[PDB]
C-alpha cells in the first residue's frame, strides 16, 4: 500500500518518492558508457577494428606502428560520442521548457500560495490550478469555486476525446475556499501502487474525524486541462514517472536502421574475402620459403618450422590487408546523416507559418529509412482532426440548408421530394415573413437550437458572449442558433432568456424539466412552457432510438429526412434528429407527480430517472435533423490519398468511441460508402475467435479480383483487440488485416497502441511509422522504427520524445516522398562508392604479392596511402550523399509510385554490393597489368639512360587509381552543381599540386625520404603522362557503354522520369 500524509514536508521525505521531473533524454550521466558501447560495438566493423588492434600487440608480427588502428578507432568513437552528446544536449534543452512552468504551492510556514516551477512539487503538497492550465501531477481535487464543487477536465491528452469530463469533490471536504483555513488537514491517505489502468481508483483518506472513500470520479490525472472554471485545490498523490499515464514511457531506445542491418551483412562477405586473400598469401609464402629456400640465401631467413611460420605470416597479412574495410566510411556516414538531417529541418515547405515551429530531426541516425515506410500508424483526435465542432448543414421539411452551397450537388433535382442544397439567405427570407408554410416549424426549430441544452453562458469583460458546454456538439448547436439569429443570453433555474436578432426583442422561457444524457437512452429532452400558457417538449438525439418513439398519422416528412440523414452520414457528419410536441396540462397534473416521485426513492436513482422520462412519448412531431462537422487539418484527405497511392497502408488507432471514429474516415476519404466494414465488437474470447474464423472462411471462399480488396475495411474495438492480441492464436487477426484497405481501432489503451506496432514489426519485414499527438500515444512512438510527433497545438509530450517533430499532418506527404526517396538514394551510393574506392587501390597490394615472393611489400608508402581517403577521395562521397538528387522535387510529388522504388531493396543490398566489389577488382587488376607492362625492367625513361625504381613506379599506380575513382564518381553524379565541380575535378587538381610540393620539402625534414627525386622521374618524363590517359579510359570504357545501354534500350521506371525532366516533355 502507498501511504501519504496530508500536511507535512518532514515525514513524507522518509519514503523517497520521486520528484516531478521528466527525462526524454537518451543518455544519462550514469549510463552513457555502457549504452554507448552497446550501440557502437553492435556493428561488425568496430569489432573488426578492435580485434585488429589486439593483433598488433603481438611482438614482431607488427611491421608498422602499434597504435595505427586503435588511434583511429578512438577518433571514430570520439566523433560518435560528440554527435550523440550534441543530440542529447538538444533533447535536454527541449525538455527543460516543461520543468520550468509556473506552479503554485501551499507553504505551511507562509500560509500563502507561492509560485514555483514544475520540478519542485513533491508528494502531498496543496496545488492551486487556474483555468486552461495543464495539471501538474495526479491531484485529487479538494475545493473549487463552484456550488458543492464541480469542474470540467478535458482529457484530450489522456486519451482522444472531445467531450469534457465531469469531476466533483467529496462532502464535508469541499468547503476549503480561499487560501486561509487550510491548517486543520490532519491524517493520512492509503492508495494503491501506481498503475497504468486508467478509470480505476480505490482507497480511503483517513481524516482527523473519520474515513472518506475515494473513486475515479475525483481523480484528475496529469495531462488533462481545466475548462470553464476558475481555480481548484488539489492534493498530489503520484508524480513524475509514477503518473498513471507517463508510466510505460521509457528513455529513447537504440533504433537501428535497415541500412545498418544490411551493412552488417555486407561486412561479413568482406571478411570472407579477406580470409581467402590472407590464406592464399600465407600458403604462397610458405611454399616459396620451403621449396625455393636455396635460391633465396641473400635474404638470410631465420629458418623454423612451417607451423611457426604460417602463424606469423597470417598475423602479418592480417594488418597488411586490414585496409579493405575502410575506417573513414563509418565516420563519413555519420557526418552525411547528420548534415542531411539538418537540411531537412530547414525547408520552408515543412515549416508552419502561423506558429513558427519548423521541423526538427532529433534523431539523425534514422533519416535514411524515411523512403522505405510501408505502414503508417496514425491518430484521430489531435493528429487528424483539429478538435473543432461546427454546425455545417441543416434539414427542415425535407430540405437541406447550407451556408456555402458545394459544387457536387449545387441545386436541387426535386425528384419526388426536394433533395439538394440551398443557401441560408433563403431560410432567412422565409423566416422573415409569416406567410410561408414552414415559418412556424422553422421558428420552433430555432427556439430549439437555443434553449434545450445545458450550456452555461458567461459575459466577458470586453462584451463577448462565451458558452461553456460539457459536450462540444451542444456548444456547436448553440453557436449555430446564435449566429443564425437566436442568441441565447442568460440562464437561471426556471428562466432561459434568448436575444432575437429580429426586432431586438429578448424572450423568456420557464424551463420546467430536462432529462440528462445517458449512453442507453441517447436522447436530450426538455419540457417547459412558452410565454402564452401552453406546454411544449423538445427532444433531440440519434435516429436509432427516437424512430421507435413516434408514429405516422399526418406528418409525411419522414422519408425525406431519412434520405437527408443518409446523404449526411455518407460524408462524415454527426447528425441529430429533433422532435417537438405540444401537450396540455390535463396530462401534466399527473406527469409532475410521476416525475417528482423519482426524487423520493433513496436507494436507486439511476434506475428511476431513466424510466421516469420513458412515459411521455406518444407521437412526436419530427422537425428535421442537424449536421455537426469536425474540421480536419489542412490537407488531410489529399495527404491520405497520396500516401495510399504510393503503396503505404495507413492505419488508425484512437482511444475514442467507435461511432466517432467511423465517420472520421468518410470525411478524409479513408473509407467509402461502398466498402465492406468488417466490424468486430465481441465481449468474450470465444466470440471474437469465432468471428475471426468465420471472417477468414468467408474471405477464403472467394478467389478475389481487382475489386473486393479495395472495398474492405477492418474496424476493431478495444476489448476485442485485447482478445485478438494474445499470443495463443493471434495470426488469425494478422492474416485478415493484410487484405483490408484500411484498419481502424477504437477505444484502445495507450499500451495497446504500442502492442499493435510491436506485433506488426515482429511478424513481418516491413518498416512502420507511428505519428501521434498527446501523451497517450508516446509508447507507440517509442515502438515503431520512425516516430513522428505533432508540435504546436494542445499537447507537446508526443513531440519531445519522438524522432521528427512536424507542425501539420500535410508535411508528412513531403517528408516521405521527397526527403525520403532522396536520403535513401543518397546514403546508398555514397556507401557503395566508398567500398569501391577503397577496393580499387588496396587490391593492388594483393596483386603485387605474386611479384615479391609473397612478402607483402607495399607499392606506395604509409604517408601517401594515408592521405587517400583523407584529402583526395573524401569530398566526392559528401557531395554524392548530401547535395545530389536523381529526380527533381516536383516529380516525386507527381508520381508517388516512384516511392515503391525505396519500399523494396532496389538501391542498397548485398547482391548490389558484390557489383561494386567485383568492379573494384577489375579496375585494380587493369591498373596493375598496365603498369607492370609499361615498366618492363624499369627501362621506361628517356633521360640519359636512367631507370625508374620502386617508388617511381608506385606513384604511377597511386595516380592512375585516383583518376579512375573520380571518373566513376563523375559517371555516377546525376546533378553536376557548383559543389561537385570542387569535389570531383577539384580533388584531382589537388593531388597534382600537392605531390610536387610534398615530395620536395618533406624528404628534407626526415619525413618520408623515399620521394627524394621521384618528381624528376615522374613529372619530368613523357611516359608518366601518357599512361594517365590510356589507363583510366581503358578501365572506365565498360561502365560508360553499359550506362548508355541501360538508359536507352533497357530503361527502368526512373530512367524515363529523368529523361522527362531533361527535355521537359510529359
Amino acid at each position: 500500500p502507498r501511504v501519504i500524509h496530508i500536511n507535512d514536508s518532514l515525514a513524507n521525505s522518509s519514503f523517497g518518492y520521486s520528484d516531478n521531473h521528466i527525462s526524454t533524454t537518451k543518455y544519462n550521466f550514469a549510463t552513457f558508457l555502457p549504452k554507448f558501447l552497446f550501440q557502437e560495438f553492435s556493428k561488425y566493423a568496430n569489432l573488426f577494428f578492435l580485434c585488429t588492434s589486439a593483433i598488433q600487440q603481438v611482438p614482431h608480427v607488427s611491421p608498422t606502428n602499434r597504435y595505427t588502428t586503435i588511434g583511429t578507432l578512438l577518433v571514430v568513437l570520439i566523433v560518435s560520442a560528440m554527435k550523440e552528446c550534441i543530440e542529447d544536449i538538444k533533447r535536454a534543452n527541449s525538455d527543460k521548457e516543461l520543468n520550468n512552468s509556473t506552479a503554485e504551492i501551499f507553504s505551511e510556514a507562509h500560509d500563502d500560495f507561492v509560485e514555483k516551477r514544475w520540478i519542485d512539487i513533491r508528494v502531498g503538497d496543496i496545488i492551486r490550478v487556474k483555468s486552461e492550465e495543464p495539471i501538474p501531477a495526479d491531484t485529487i481535487i479538494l475545493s473549487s469555486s463552484e456550488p458543492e464543487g464541480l469542474c470540467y477536465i478535458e482529457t484530450a491528452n489522456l486519451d482522444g476525446e472531445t467531450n469534457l469530463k465531469i469531476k466533483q469533490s467529496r462532502v464535508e471536504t469541499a468547503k476549503f475556499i480561499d487560501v486561509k483555513t487550510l491548517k486543520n488537514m490532519n491524517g493520512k491517505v492509503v492508495s494503491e501502487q501506481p498503475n497504468s489502468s486508467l478509470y480505476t481508483y480505490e482507497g480511503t483518506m483517513t481524516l482527523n474525524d473519520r474515513q472518506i472513500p475515494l473513486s475515479p470520479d475525483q481523480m484528475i490525472l496529469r495531462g488533462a486541462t481545466l475548462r470553464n472554471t476558475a481555480w481548484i485545490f488539489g492534493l498530489v498523490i503520484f508524480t513524475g514517472h509514477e503518473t498513471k499515464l507517463l508510466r510505460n514511457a521509457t528513455a529513447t531506445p537504440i533504433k537501428r536502421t535497415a541500412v545498418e542491418k544490411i551493412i552488417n551483412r555486407q561486412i561479413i562477405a568482406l571478411f570472407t574475402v579477406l580470409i581467402v586473400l590472407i590464406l592464399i598469401s600465407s600458403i604462397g609464402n610458405v611454399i616459396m620459403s620451403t621449396a625455393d629456400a636455396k635460391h633465396l640465401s641473400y635474404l638470410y631467413l631465420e629458418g623454423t618450422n612451417k607451423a611457426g611460420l604460417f602463424f606469423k605470416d597470417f598475423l602479418t597479412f592480417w594488418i597488411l590487408f586490414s585496409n579493405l574495410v575502410p575506417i573513414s566510411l563509418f565516420v563519413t556516414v555519420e557526418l552525411i546523416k547528420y548534415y542531411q538531417a539538418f537540411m531537412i529541418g530547414s525547408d520552408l515547405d515543412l515549416y508552419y507559418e502561423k506558429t513558427d515551429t519548423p521541423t526538427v530531426v532529433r534523431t539523425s541516425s534514422l533519416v535514411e529509412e524515411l523512403g522505405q515506410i510501408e505502414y503508417i500508424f496514425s491518430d484521430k483526435t489531435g493528429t487528424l482532426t483539429r478538435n473543432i465542432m461546427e454546425f455545417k448543414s441543416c434539414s427542415i421539411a425535407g430540405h437541406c440548408y447550407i451556408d456555402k452551397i458545394p459544387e457536387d450537388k449545387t441545386a436541387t433535382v426535386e425528384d419526388g421530394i426536394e433533395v439538394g442544397y440551398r443557401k441560408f439567405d433563403d431560410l432567412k427570407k422565409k423566416l422573415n415573413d409569416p406567410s410561408d408554410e414552414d415559418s412556424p416549424i422553422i421558428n420552433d426549430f430555432l427556439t430549439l437550437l437555443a434553449t434545450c441544452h445545458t450550456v452555461i453562458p458567461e459575459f466577458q469583460s470586453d462584451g463577448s458572449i462565451k458558452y461553456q458546454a460539457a459536450s462540444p456538439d451542444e456548444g456547436a448547436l448553440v453557436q449555430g442558433g446564435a449566429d443564425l439569429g437566436y442568441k441565447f443570453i442568460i440562464r437561471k433555474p426556471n428562466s432561459v432568456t434568448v436575444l432575437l436578432e429580429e426586432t431586438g426583442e429578448e424572450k423568456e422561457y420557464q424551463l420546467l424539466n430536462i432529462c440528462e444524457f445517458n449512453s442507453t437512452r441517447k436522447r436530450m429532452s426538455a419540457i417547459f412552457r412558452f410565454p402564452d400558457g401552453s406546454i411544449k417538449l423538445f427532444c433531440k438525439g440519434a435516429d436509432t432510438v427516437i424512430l421507435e418513439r413516434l408514429d405516422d398519422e399526418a406528418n409525411q416528412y419522414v422519408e425525406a429526412t431519412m434520405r437527408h440523414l443518409e446523404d449526411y452520414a455518407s460524408e462524415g457528419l454527426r447528425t441529430l434528429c429533433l422532435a417537438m410536441r405540444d401537450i396540455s396540462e390535463g396530462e401534466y397534473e399527473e406527469w409532475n407527480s410521476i416525475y417528482n416521485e423519482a426524487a423520493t426513492t433513496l436507494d436507486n436513482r439511476a434506475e428511476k430517472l431513466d424510466e421516469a422520462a420513458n412515459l411521455i412519448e406518444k407521437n412526436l412531431i419530427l422537425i428535421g435533423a442537424t449536421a455537426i462537422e469536425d474540421k480536419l487539418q489542412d490537407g488531410v484527405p489529399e495527404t491520405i490519398h497520396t500516401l495510399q497511392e504510393a503503396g503505404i497502408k495507413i492505419w488508425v488507432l484512437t482511444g475514442d468511441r467507435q461511432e466517432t471514429a467511423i465517420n472520421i474516415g468518410m470525411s478524409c476519404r479513408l473509407l467509402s460508402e461502398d466498402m465492406n466494414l468488417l466490424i468486430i465488437n465481441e465481449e468474450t474470447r470465444d466470440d471474437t475467435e469465432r468471428n475471426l474464423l468465420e471472417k477468414i472462411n468467408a474471405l477464403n471462399e472467394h478467389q478475389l479480383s481487382t475489386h473486393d480488396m479495395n472495398t474492405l475495411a477492418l474496424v476493431i474495438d478495444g476489448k476485442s483487440l485485447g482478445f485478438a492480441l494474445e499470443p495463443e492464436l493471434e495470426d488469425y487477426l494478422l492474416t485478415v488485416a493484410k487484405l483490408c484497405k484500411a484498419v481502424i481501432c477504437c477505444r484502445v489503451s495507450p499500451l495497446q497502441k504500442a502492442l499493435v506496432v510491436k506485433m506488426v514489426k515482429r511478424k513481418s519485414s516491413s518498416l512502420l511509422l507511428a505519428i501521434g499527438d498527446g501523451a497517450n500515444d508516446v509508447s507507440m512512438i517509442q515502438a515503431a522504427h520512425v516516430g513522428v510527433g505533432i508540435s504546436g497545438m494542445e499537447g507537446m509530450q508526443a513531440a519531445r520524445s519522438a524522432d521528427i517533430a512536424v507542425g501539420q499532418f500535410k508535411f508528412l506527404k513531403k517528408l516521405l516522398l521527397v526527403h525520403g526517396s532522396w536520403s535513401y538514394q543518397r546514403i546508398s551510393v555514397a556507401i557503395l562508392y566508398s567500398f569501391y574506392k577503397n577496393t580499387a587501390l588496396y587490391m593492388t597490394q594483393f596483386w603485387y604479392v605474386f611479384a615479391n615472393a609473397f612478402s607483402g611489400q607495399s607499392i606506395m608508402e604509409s604517408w601517401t596511402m594515408s592521405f587517400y581517403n583523407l584529402f583526395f577521395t573524401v569530398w566526392p562521397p559528401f557531395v554524392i550523399g548530401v547535395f545530389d538528387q536523381f529526380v527533381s522535387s516536383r516529380l516525386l510529388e507527381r508520381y508517388p509510385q516512384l516511392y515503391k522504388l525505396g519500399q523494396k531493396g532496389q538501391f542498397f543490398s548485398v547482391y548490389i554490393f558484390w557489383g561494386w566489389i567485383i568492379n573494384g577488382f577489375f579496375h585494380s587488376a587493369i591498373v596493375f597489368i598496365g603498369t607492370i607492362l609499361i615498366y618492363r625492367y624499369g627501362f621506361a625513361l628517356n633521360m640519359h639512360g636512367e631507370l625508374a625504381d620502386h617508388w617511381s613506379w608506385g606513384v604511377t599506380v597511386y595516380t592512375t587509381s585516383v583518376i579512375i575513382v573520380l571518373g566513376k564518381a563523375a559517371l555516377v553524379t546525376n546533378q553536376w552543381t557548383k559543389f561537385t565541380l570542387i569535389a570531383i575535378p577539384g580533388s584531382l587538381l589537388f593531388w597534382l599540386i600537392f605531390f610536387p610540393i610534398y615530395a620536395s620539402i618533406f624528404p628534407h625534414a626526415n619525413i618520408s625520404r623515399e620521394y627524394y627525386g621521384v618528381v624528376k622521374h615522374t613529372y619530368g618524363s613523357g611516359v608518366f603522362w601518357l599512361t594517365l590517359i590510356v589507363l583510366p579510359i581503358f578501365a572506365l570504357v565498360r561502365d560508360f557503354l553499359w550506362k548508355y545501354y541501360k538508359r536507352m534500350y533497357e530503361p527502368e521506371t526512373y530512367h524515363v522520369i529523368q529523361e522527362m525532366q531533361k527535355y521537359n516533355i510529359s
Binding site: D292, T357, A851, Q897, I932, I934, R936, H944, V1030
Partner: protein, 350 residues
Amino acid sequence: PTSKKPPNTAFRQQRLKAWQPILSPQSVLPLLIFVACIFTPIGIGLIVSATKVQDLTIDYSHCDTKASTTAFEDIPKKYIKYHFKSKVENKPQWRLTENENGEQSCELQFEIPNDIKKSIFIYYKITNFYQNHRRYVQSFDTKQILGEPIKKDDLDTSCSPIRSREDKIIYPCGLIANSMFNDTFSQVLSGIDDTEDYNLTNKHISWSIDRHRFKTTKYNASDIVPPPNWMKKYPDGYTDENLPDIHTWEEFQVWMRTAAFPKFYKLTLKNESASLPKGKYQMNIELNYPISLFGGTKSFVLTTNGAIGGRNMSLGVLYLIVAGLCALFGIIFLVKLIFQPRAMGDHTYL
C-alpha cells in the same frame, strides 16, 4: 523572440544551378568516334617508335660450363636476342678464358651491322632476383650512408641479419650492399679486324640525387669491417687505402636503388655524342657473381635509348586496343539506331 524561420537562400532550400547529363545517342557515338580517331594516330606513333630501337641481349650465363677454352665456340640460339635495322651475317660467338688464380672471364664476340647513330647504353639483366622483398627494400642505415660515423647501439634495426660481427661495426650493413653484383664489365668495346675500339664510361650513371646524398665516410679505418660477402676483395679488414667511398662508387649507387620487379635492368656503361660503326666487337666480362645465389640468368644488354626506352609495344598496343573498343561498340550501337527503332518514352510502368 526569434522568428525560427529558415532562410530563403538557394542553398538551404536545395535549389542550385545544375546540368543534368543524359547520354543521348548523338553524344556517345560522336564521343567514341573522336576517341578512336584520336587514339589511332598516337597508337601508331607509339608503335613505330619502339621499332627504331636496336638491342642485343647475350645471356652470358653458363659460360663456365658451355664455352670452350681452346677457341671460340658458337652460342646456342636460346641465349641471343638481337633486334637491328639490318640483318647480321655471322652468328655471335663466345669463349672462356682462365687467367691467373681462378678469375675466369667470358669473351663475347658479336657484330654490329647497322651503324647506330644513337647513344649506346650497356646494362645487365638479372632474372629471378626478388629485390622488392619486404625485408630487403628498407635494409640500410640512412645516417651511415650519409657519411656520419654511427656508434654501436645507434644503428637502425633494418640491418638485422648482419650488423655487428664480434663487437665490430659493418660500414655497409643490411641485406642490400651485401649481395651487390660484382661482375666487372670491360670499359671498352675492343674492336677487332679492321675495326677500332669503342671507349665507354661509367660516370654519371646513377641518379642526380644519389651522387648528392652519398657522402664520403668519416668512420675510423680500424673500427669498421667489410660485409661477409666482401671478404674476397677486402681481406684483413679495412685499412687506410681500403676504404671505398660511396661518393664516386657509382656502381654502388646504381645497385642501392631497389628495383620494383624480379626482372630489372641496371645501368653500367654508356657512350653519348658518338656513333657506333659497323663491324665485329668483343666484350670481356669477369665472372664473380654465381647464378646459384639466386637461380636466375645474367645477361649483357646493349641498347639505344628511344622515346619510351627500349622495344616495348605494351604502351602503343593499349592506345590501339581502346580504339578497337571504340570502332566496335561505336558501330554496333549505330546499327541498332537505324535498324531497330527505339520508343521515345511515356511508357512508365507505374
